[PDB]
Amino acid sequence: SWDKDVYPEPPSRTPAPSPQTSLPNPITYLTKAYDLVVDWPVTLVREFIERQHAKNRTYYYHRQYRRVPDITECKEGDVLCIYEAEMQWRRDFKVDQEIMNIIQERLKACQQREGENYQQNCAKELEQFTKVTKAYQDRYLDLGAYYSARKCLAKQKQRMLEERKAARQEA
Amino acid sequence: AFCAPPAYLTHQQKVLRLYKRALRHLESWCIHRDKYRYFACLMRARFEEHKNEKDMMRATQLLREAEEEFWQNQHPQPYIFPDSPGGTSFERYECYKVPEWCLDYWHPSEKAMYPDYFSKREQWKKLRMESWDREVKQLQEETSPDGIMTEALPPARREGDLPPLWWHIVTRPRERPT
Amino acid sequence: DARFLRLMKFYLMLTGIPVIIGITLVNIFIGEAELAEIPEGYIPEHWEYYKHPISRWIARNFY
Amino acid sequence: MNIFTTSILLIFILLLSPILISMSNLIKHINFPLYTTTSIKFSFIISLLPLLMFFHNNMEYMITTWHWVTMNSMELKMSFKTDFFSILFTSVALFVTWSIMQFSSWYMHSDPNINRFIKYLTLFLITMLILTSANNMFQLFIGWEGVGIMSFLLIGWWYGRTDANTAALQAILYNRIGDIGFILAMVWFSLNMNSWELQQIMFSNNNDNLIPLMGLLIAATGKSAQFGLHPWLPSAMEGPTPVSALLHSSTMVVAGIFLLVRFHPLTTNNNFILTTMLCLGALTTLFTAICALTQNDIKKIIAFSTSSQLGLMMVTLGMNQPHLAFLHICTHAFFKAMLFMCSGSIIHSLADEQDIRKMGNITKIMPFTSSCLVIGSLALTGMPFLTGFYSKDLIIEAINTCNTNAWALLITLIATSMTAMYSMRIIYFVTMTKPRFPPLISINENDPDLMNPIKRLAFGSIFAGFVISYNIPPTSIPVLTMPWFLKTTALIISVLGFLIALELNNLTMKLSMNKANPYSSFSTLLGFFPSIIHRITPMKSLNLSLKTSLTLLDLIWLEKTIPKSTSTLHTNMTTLTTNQKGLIKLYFMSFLINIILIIILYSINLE
Amino acid sequence: MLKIILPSLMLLPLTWLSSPKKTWTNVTSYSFLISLTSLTLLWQTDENYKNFSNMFSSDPLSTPLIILTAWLLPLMLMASQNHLKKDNNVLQKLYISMLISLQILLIMTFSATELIMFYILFEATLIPTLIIITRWGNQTERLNAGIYFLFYTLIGSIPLLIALILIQNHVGTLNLMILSFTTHTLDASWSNNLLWLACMMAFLIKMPLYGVHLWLPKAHVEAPIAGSMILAAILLKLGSYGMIRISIILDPLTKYMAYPFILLSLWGMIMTSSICLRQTDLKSLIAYSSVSHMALVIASIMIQTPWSFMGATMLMIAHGLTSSLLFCLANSNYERIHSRTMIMARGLQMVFPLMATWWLMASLANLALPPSINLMGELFITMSLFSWSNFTIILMGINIIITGMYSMYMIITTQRGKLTNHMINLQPSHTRELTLMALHMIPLILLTTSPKLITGLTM
Amino acid sequence: QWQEDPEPEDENVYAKNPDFHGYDSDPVVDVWNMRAVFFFGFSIVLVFGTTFVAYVPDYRMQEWARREAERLVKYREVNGLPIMESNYFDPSKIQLPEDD
């Protein structure tokens, strides 16, 4: 249904039952009852509905936008090029937010499955989080509520200036 | 509640109310009934001792000294009858004390379920409309021209007349309506 | 007050019940479309990018 | 992954069904109290199954049901955190509410709007379950404020008493002062972590979390009725006693302790917060256990006892023992609610009388209620192998076996003694003396609505601590090797308290005259805290708001400055300009002035 | 946009050419239908805002305000039927025409791409409002109220016109799409600072600020119920919309020219919320609460962060709905006793049990009861400010406390307590006013269910 | 004292028409105004507009952005790339000053 390469979920090595007494487990029998009584009619309703879906089946696609010159390739005052570039930048910005959200979700799920040993076994997700957060910070952070592509560009430029001046110096 | 306090409070009334408050606070201290009976006999002895003191200068001085002593050694959490000021059930039922005129807006459907009651109600309303002017004039004609009033109401001197200003004492909602 | 409540319930249900029922039918029998890849040299109409039948019907006939 | 979640959600579905009916025409015919009681009972039975599956495998879930809104880089969902805490509290609260529902069906048979009462109880229960099963802090805040408003509405059930609306407003005020810290925490976590979820907040463990932790601590102070913000809880006794047994005894007030339990992974690495918890809790315990030693209103005693136990729970949270505090939370509700319900029976029989001075012997005339009340008082005290013991014992052990402030330890032991003391005060002035109540007897405690819930809560108060403490997993490591005079210290304390109170009361039976000693007028009067604060702070607030804010500025000075200065300026310039004399001689003289001015301007500027 | 405006025009001939009896029903129904038609603007399936012409447009910021403005008209019409029942047919038609013109001009203002159309209409919304106030208000302070309302706004707006003309002469166009891509840093200078003042103070007086807010309570107190509703809900949002649109060309002067106004707003929030305690007039209480709430909008817009704009939009929508609701509730009791004092009628839960639930729910939305959208706005504004300076939460929290306090005071001393038995004229609640409260409340539930709509351009 | 009419006497609108809804003194007008209000407000608007909005797809490009973020994280984890570069614009597109 949903991709593992995006929302990975480990295999959940499960331990086998080791009953060591004579009393019955009231959960296995209640569970068989619940299955027979709930999962079967629901599963049947679902079979019927999926069949009615198979009949009159419908399709829908994912909108692919082509690449258009960024604002670097646009001129001061040319509002056409700038409009296209800025709509693109907003698209990519929304996409980057959704990426960061995917990563936060992966982190939450990892921490939950691990449990007490989440400082271990959950440092890869935290590392990816730190990384993408550093990036997001460095490319979208200090812009105001009027964020656009020119502001991101100026921020990138001042950052590269400061770094190039910290590199030229000490050389 | 039903009576209106007078202009000022006499000396005997002051003493009686001090007696009452003292005995109540003493009941509050003396929780057990025998202890209370004993110390109440003592308190009545303390009062009755200066009972025939004729002078007033010393009477008021004793009264004020007693008020001071009462404010001292005064139970901070005295007993308060529940339905009384400061009690648990003081106005607990004042939310169900809907007045009577709320029925003048009832819908004829709501009324058809209680016909006898509303016939009686119209009878009462006619009674009131008839007695109004007579009681008004009874009031205006027997106001002492001295110029000082008393807040108390007169009875229905003439026969066939209803006592003035009765529709709010009568028709008063009950005290535990549910 | 009870009259107002009765009337509000009646006039909401009068259209919300047919709507709910139509939605349940659409989702039981027609349902949602499934993702896919654009066949080469095919231009999907603007409504073939949406998922739900109501959504794309509205989109087609009004947008 | 299916059965568990199915039940966790069906519980809420069941709690909601009564309320959706209340907005329908059925409520006219069907018996709504019985319907709600049945729904609560079935919710409890259903919730028993998650509890079993957790006792078995000790697995806990994170369940995201409905995606509400995605704000850029920050998602909001209705996520549930079914851990030990949430599941056990759900089951316990549902048992207690099942009992309270019957007790109210009996205690409020005379109230016309009783269905509204049941609906409000159920709404509070739903809000509490939300506040208890929430993985997100917005959902926690929802439950928080919902509990607050439900308290306001239930305390103010009798909206003719100007003394009940006061208490409701009081509670609102204090719990909003706590909301301030709660919101501080939310803000800090939204900026420094970007998520209100706990799974993402947990990675702040290696950071400096003093600000949000102080926010949470202020919120707990406000809700659990700690010292600076205690008064609202007893004042809440203006409401019907089922409200007091449900909200202001067992579940609502417990929300602060529960919250600080839910964030214990962050307090373990901060000692400032632990020590302030310790001090606040010990001080509350002492102060309230004191104030209860001279109160004659049974409800107020049962409430100060609750405040003391909350202080003790906060102490527990101070020495890094959250699981113990939650176990005490779960074991306390049983006997505390049974205590409130015994009080409510006694009050309904004696015609609203709540003052122990007019109660007298209750053994002879209410043996069943009296036995249940004694069981409750015992469980409140140690009384080994009842529900209270299985927590309070380990509480006392942990406090007397850790590097703790000595004053806190001392006053906690003193407060356990005082617990025994006022428990015995109740048992004496209500169960062992001779009558003081009116001579007409209209006593009846045979109605099955009164007896079945009380005896269920009694079975609880007796066996539930054993059951739980044996079914739970081992969370912490208890110190089990200490001198005799520390493992037997809680029992010694309670016994000495019993004996001392017994002697003091057998003495007040004598014929000497009691007096107003200054050390009791301090207890009888809540330590003067209300008497001075509740009329000095509102005085300043409400006099400032008028004098300095409304009149001085808005009605006087802004008006004088801007509009009523512009107006005066322009009307004066008008009087100047237009008040001429109608003489052409003067007009022409002015025309000459203008001629000359123009000629001069020209001459100097250009020539 | 024409499909929303031309029907709003034809409403006028429908008002005048209609029989005296069927004039209210027709206009009310067709206004509801127009509110419906306005729901197409929510069909935004992309990040590309809707431009319908060189003049009319609608972004995620203007669409909620337009829908609210189209939805408030029928509610005002309804609320305005108990009074005017004894007025002549022509007067009723004139009132309805005033309201329709207000609707139309506001939809235009929110749809305008250019700032000169926005200004012309921003100012045209003074004529019908002033007429409503001074012609159908009841007391004599009508006139001073209208005067204040006119001249605060005009003295603020004139500099705005001068600044717009200056920007025109410097840039070539006052279009909002062009002024956003073709932008330049404003050199820090006293001239550009005065330009900032000119561009801002008109809106700041319309939000309003704390120092200049006396025109609002006078109006609300002396305005009929419809005027109060539209004013509180829309004619204040007007200033915030203007500031949000015009603050792009004032960068970065907004970084240091804001402290005065952020500060005045944060402090006047406390001052006004405190006034709302020692206030005898219910309408004045509602007005001062509105000021306390708009202070947050001003501060948020001043710091201009995404969370800030979002919270501001949510708070605008929610406050409009709930304040219109509270004024409706107050006028309900006013029509019975004809007094605005909150102390006279103080047991109304024993006669109007259902109408009290409206009081309760509103006062809960007035304060921030979650998951209300009145709360999400306050919360995100608090967060933005905390990020701004961590010492704002002090004032924010004491404001929260005072807010709970005076809302509870309102509902307690108005509904709860002992009934005033001499008030024999407390007729039961009208189905119409009950529908009014329902129509004000249900949309709050629905928005709380779907908040993605009222976020704004930032989200 | 100059001439005017005296302040009138308040009226109980339910007196003559107990089945009064608050709209008009004439009953028929009252009932039909009530019905039109209820219909066009609840049955029409609050229902059909609510549905129209609930079935608006991809509101402000929200589902599409999610799908594309999935596509991109997949591609970039499968091709070694990182999930987000600290620079939006390729520096080759950028010519920084020749500061001296």
Which terms summarize this structure?
part of a larger assembly; 6 chains; E: 459 residues; mainly alpha; 68% helix; globular; F: 100 residues; 3 helices; mitochondrion (chain E); respiratory chain (chain E); transmembrane helix (chain E)
Description:
Chain F: This is NADH dehydrogenase [ubiquinone] 1 beta subcomplex subunit 11, mitochondrial. The structure is cut from a larger assembly and holds chains A (171 residues), B (178 residues), C (63 residues), D (607 residues), E (459 residues) and F (100 residues). With 63 residues, chain C is mainly alpha-helical. Chain C is 62% helix and 0% strand. Chain C is built from two helices and no strands. Chain C has helices spanning 2-30, 53-62. Chain D is mainly alpha-helical. Chain D is globular. In chain E, 68% of the residues lie in helices and 1% in strands. In chain E, strands 1-2 form a two-stranded antiparallel ribbon. Chain E contains 19 helices and two strands. The chains are: A mainly alpha (171), B mainly alpha (178), C mainly alpha (63), D mainly alpha (607), E mainly alpha (459), F mainly alpha (100). Chains A and C meet through helix 1 of A and helix 1 of C.
Which series of helices and strands of chain B comes N to C? Answer: HHHHH
Quaternary structure of the protein: part of a larger assembly
The profile of the biggest β sheet of chain D is: 2 strands, antiparallel
Helix segment tally of chain D:
25
Discrete helix count of chain B: 5
Distance between the termini of chain B: 23 Å
Q: Class by helix and strand content of chain B? A: mainly alpha
**Helix fraction of chain B by DSSP (H/I, runs of at least 4):** 40-55%
Structural class of chain D: mainly alpha
Largest sheet of chain B: none
What string gives the helices and strands of chain D in order? HHEEHHHHHHHHHHHHHHHHHHHHHHH
Q: Shape of chain B, please?
A: flat
N-to-C span of chain D: 101 Å
**Large-scale geometry of chain D:** globular
Query: How are strands sequenced across the largest beta sheet of chain D?
Result: 1-2
Number of domains of chain D: 2
Percent of sequence in beta strands of chain B: under 5%
Instruction: Please give the radius of gyration of chain B in angstroms.
Output: 25 Å
Rounded to the nearest angstrom, the radius of gyration of chain D is 31 Å
Which band does the percent of strand residues of chain D land in? Answer: under 5%
Helix content of chain D: over 70%
